[PDB]
């Protein structure tokens, strides 16, 4: 007898994020839940999970990663629910 | 007899983030929950999980990582729910 | 007879972050919960979990990591729920 | 008969962070909870968990890590919920 | 008969951080809870948990770590919930 009750009675305009999980019972992953509420901004990956036996014999490699740039990010209220509020991004 | 009650009665506009988990019972991962509420900003990974036996014999490698740049990040209220408030990002 | 009660009755607009977990019973990980509320900012990883037997014989490697840049981060209210407040980021 | 009660009755707009955990009963990790509320800022890792038998025979390696840069971080209210307050980051 | 009561009745807008844990009963870790409220700022790790038998025979290694940079961190109210207060970071 499993009984789960979340936000049974609500009145009055709330701002909500809800995640409810109920469960009764090279790379390998069997059973999982990943990234339910997840934000990636300016994420990088250069060399991931190359095949078996890469560059096995007499390999000559020059690897050069240059992250150099006038990049700008401006964010308000990331994963922040709000109510009866004022959110703004004003430039000049 | 398992009974879980979260936010049974709510009145009056709250701002909420809810995560409820109820459970009754190279790289390997069997059972898990990951990154329910998770933020990555300017995350890097250069060489991850290369295959078995890489650069096995007589390898000559030059690795150079240069992170050098005029990058700007401006964030208000990251994972911070708010109510009856004022959030702003004002430039000049 | 397990009974868990969190935030049974709420009135009056609170700002909340809730995480409730109820449970009754190279790299390996069996059962876990990770990063429920987790923020990574400017995180780095250069060489992780290379395959078995890398650079096994007569390897010549030059590794050079240069993190050198005019990077700026400006954040208000990181994982800090607030109510009836004023949050601002003002430049000049 | 396990009974857990957290924040049974709330009135009046508090700002809260709640984590409730109830449980009745190379690298290896069996069962755990990690990083429920966790912030990483400017975190580094250069060589982690290389495969078995790396650089086994006659290895010649030059490792040079240079962290040298005009980086600036400015944060207000990190993991500090607040109510009826004023939080600001003012430049010039 | 285990009974735990935390913050049974609250009135009047307090700012709180709550962690309640109730439990009835190379690297290895079986059962644990880690980093519930944990902040890492400018954390470093250069060589961690290399595979078994590294640099086994006739290894010639030059390791040089140079942490030398004009880095600035400015933080107010780290893990310090507050109420009816004024928090500010003012530059010039």
UniProtKB/Swiss-Prot annotation, chains A, B, C, D, E:
**So what does mutating residue 78 to M actually do?**
Loss of tetramerization
Q: What is the effect of changing residue 82 to H?
A: In CTS1; amyloid deposit on carpal tunnel; patients show no other abnormalities
Swapping residue 52 to N leads to an effect described as: In AMYLD1; vitrous amyloid
What does the UniProt record report as the effect of altering residue 62 to A in this chain?
A: In a patient with amyloidosis
Q: Does the keyword Lyase apply?
A: no
Extract the GO molecular function terms from the UniProt entry: hormone activity; hormone binding; identical protein binding; molecular sequestering activity; protein-containing complex binding
Briefly state the modifications made to the protein after translation.
Answer: Not glycosylated under normal conditions. Following unfolding, caused for example by variant AMYLD1 'Gly-38', the cryptic Asn-66 site is exposed and glycosylated by STT3B-containing OST complex, leading to its degradation by the ER-associated degradation (ERAD) pathway.
Task: Give a brief account of the tissues where this protein occurs.
Answer: Detected in serum and cerebrospinal fluid (at protein level). Highly expressed in choroid plexus epithelial cells. Detected in retina pigment epithelium and liver.
Q: What is the effect of changing residue 37 to H?
A: In AMYLD1; leptomeningeal amyloidosis; vitreous amyloid in some patients
Q: What is its main location?
A: secreted
Instruction: Return the GO cellular component terms, semicolon-separated.
Output: azurophil granule lumen; extracellular exosome; extracellular region; extracellular space; protein-containing complex
Q: Which GO terms describe its biological process?
A: negative regulation of glomerular filtration; phototransduction, visible light; purine nucleobase metabolic process; retinoid metabolic process
Q: Which UniProt keywords apply?
A: Amyloid, Amyloidosis, Cytoplasm, Disease variant, Gamma-carboxyglutamic acid, Glycoprotein, Hormone, Neuropathy, Phosphoprotein, Secreted, Signal, Sulfation, Thyroid hormone, Transport
Recorded disease is: Amyloidosis, hereditary systemic 1: A form of hereditary systemic amyloidosis, a disorder characterized by amyloid deposition in multiple tissues resulting in a wide clinical spectrum. AMYLD1 is an autosomal dominant form due to transthyretin amyloid deposition. Protein fibrils can form in different tissues leading to amyloid polyneuropathies, amyloidotic cardiomyopathy, carpal tunnel syndrome, systemic senile amyloidosis. The disease includes leptomeningeal amyloidosis that is characterized by primary involvement of the central nervous system.
Q: What is known of its domains?
A: Each monomer has two 4-stranded beta sheets and the shape of a prolate ellipsoid. Antiparallel beta-sheet interactions link monomers into dimers. A short loop from each monomer forms the main dimer-dimer interaction. These two pairs of loops separate the opposed, convex beta-sheets of the dimers to form an internal channel.
What family is it from? Belongs to the transthyretin family.
Protein name from the UniProt record:
Transthyretin
Q: Which organism is it from?
A: Homo sapiens
* This protein's encoding gene: TTR
**What is the covered span of the full protein?**
31 to 144 of 147
């Amino acid at each position: 007898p499993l009984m789960v009750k979340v936000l049974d009675a609500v009145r009055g305009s709330p701002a909500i994020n809800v995640a409810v999980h109920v469960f009764r019972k090279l790379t390998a992953e069997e059973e999982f839940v990943e990234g339910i509420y997840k934000v990636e901004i300016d994420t990088k990956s250069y060399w991931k999970a190359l095949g078996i036996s890469p560059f096995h014999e007499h390999a000559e490699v020059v690897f050069t990663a240059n992250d150099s740039g006038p990049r700008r990010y401006t964010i308000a209220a990331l994963l922040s629910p709000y109510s009866y509020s004022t959110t703004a991004v004003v430039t000049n």
